[PDB]
Amino acid sequence: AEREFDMTIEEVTIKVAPGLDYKVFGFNGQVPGPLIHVQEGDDVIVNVTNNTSLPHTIHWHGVHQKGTWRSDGVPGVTQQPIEAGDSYTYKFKADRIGTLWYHCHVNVNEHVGVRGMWGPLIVDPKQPLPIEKRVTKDVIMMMSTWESAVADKYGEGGTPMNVADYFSVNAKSFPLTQPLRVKKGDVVKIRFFGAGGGIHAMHSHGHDMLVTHKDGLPLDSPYYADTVLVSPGERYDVIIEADNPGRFIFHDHVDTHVTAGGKHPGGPITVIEYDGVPVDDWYVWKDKDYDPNFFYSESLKQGYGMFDHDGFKGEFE
Template identity: 60%
Template structure:
């Protein structure tokens, strides 16, 4: 290879790399809102852009991010970008009293870093995580598209995100409380809602569905009926050899990507196999459950979602199909407790 050819090749490679990466500038607010979690139960939360989970941030490996966070709440907060290596940008890691001062009420902070690790990541507050993350909904998904996806990823036709969390109804309505040893978590949710307020995940036969499972605040033992799961990634990184699983156990902070072939039409339950996680304040059926609903399958008259409106972006499938960026999702929005509550939509007779 001549020196000229080598120089040209390097220039082309650098040009390709630069065309992939972009500077992306986003804004997040931290707002005090009230969130309907389960029939008859709501919680006061600190929602990024007033929602739980926070907005989907979907970018590409190598992108440079500038995220300005405005604190509209009454307590200090930071944002930690969980899974980002922060190479040469450690002051933007979001740890109070270590990498930065907490963002005080009324103030803002701009985080600047390169997303140097692909996969299923997430972001969350790092002040008093037992309350702010564990009980107040301060978390959201950060999905980083890899430059070099593994072959099985290229088969995916639908990309869904599930974030698992818990709630303590005894402290749910008073900010600055909770997160103490010995407290009881008595509500369990997927994307901020407990069954039956988790919407059906709609698919059609032939889809290849990826579920991005994120342990936001509770341990979870995730099980699907009627289908096997192929576990392809852990904490954003591809496994050397994907494995088939019937149950996937994850701890708070862990992430797993699983891929499922939608080849068994029906109405199928997925649920947490930690038994009390499928209750609402001790009552069945509730908690961390959802229905995978195939298109064109007949809905019996007694089916709870028959004739009810389904939020199609509840698992962020539609937002994941949009151009890269930051995507608010209306279904996750809370209400301003001082401005009066919007009327609740009826939920299965509750």
């Protein structure tokens, strides 16, 4: 099918952590950018308008651009940049399946490293693995890092000289992240993305993960892990069988990453919360103001298309 989307690039401010507000260039004014969910073989058209003060592009990471290299999104290689106020249209066939993503390809150390210019692109295979058919909950986790010294200043950041002192999943740092709520018998697909410049060792308490896909393509030899290393650019898809009720933390095991501005706890932490487990008064997330779509799991059920999410939206000036 032909699927056409209109995307903008906006200057907004997002709250990454308690006391850390961050200026970003959000696709449709949010970080992570909108979920794009299409079927293998769809023809995709994306009309992009740059409502910011600086040039950008969009690169479609994992998309082969078969006969369509001029839509690859690389400035000075496949196009000139999309200047401030201008528009540009990308066209590609989604013939590469799996967990893909998209991100700016201008000034990437800064724009992708700390300005949140990225989002997920899910291409459903016409022939999914048998296990994929058992899945009852699909979860996106996009990890990145932040340099507080340049939070308020576009044009700086993302160099070896800077210090990454805050860490996140889907642009929030614990406790501002959200739990992953399941019930016994759920079959959970988690898609990990190394969206930023850091390496993240994602560990699930209480469960092993069956690693089934690397960069969106199914492994001939899947393997179990309790800790999956995710590095910039990569994706891993795993399956968790939710057959062990409890409250089980799920987090980046890199020790300095579970900090926020030098304080702990913080960083890419969630909790696998099973519905049947009674809540203790001392539980850190008792009475959490809950977002069921923090990992795009509700959007991923809503059919093909492009989905914004207000829990990811930042504030305009």
